[PDB]
């Protein structure tokens, strides 16, 4: 059985049973989903190992940042 989640946007993101915050955040994007610093479920703070349930809304934390080639290459 797989469970239905709502993005920011509203548009519809299937993740297969089991699945994590992490999952989600790949279902989105990489880069973006990489800089994810936390998760936010059902307006309610829960951690990355969290598991997603149907109906609830999910929203990856991003700092969003523009820095670039901070870190040594």
């Known amino acids: 059985m797989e469970v239905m989640v709502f993005t920011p946007k509203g548009e519809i993101k299937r993740l297969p049973q089991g699945a994590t915050a992490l999952d989600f955040a790949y279902s ?24 997603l349930n149907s109906g609830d809304q ?16």
Not at 29 to 45: E, F, P, R, T, Y
Not at 58 to 73: I, T, Y
């Open 58 to 73: 999910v929203e990856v934390l991003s700092s969003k940042s523009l820095e670039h080639h901070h870190h040594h290459h």
């Open 28 to 51: 989105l994007h990489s880069d973006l989903g990489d800089h994810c610093i936390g998760a936010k479920v059902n307006h309610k703070l829960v951690p990355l190992s969290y598991v």
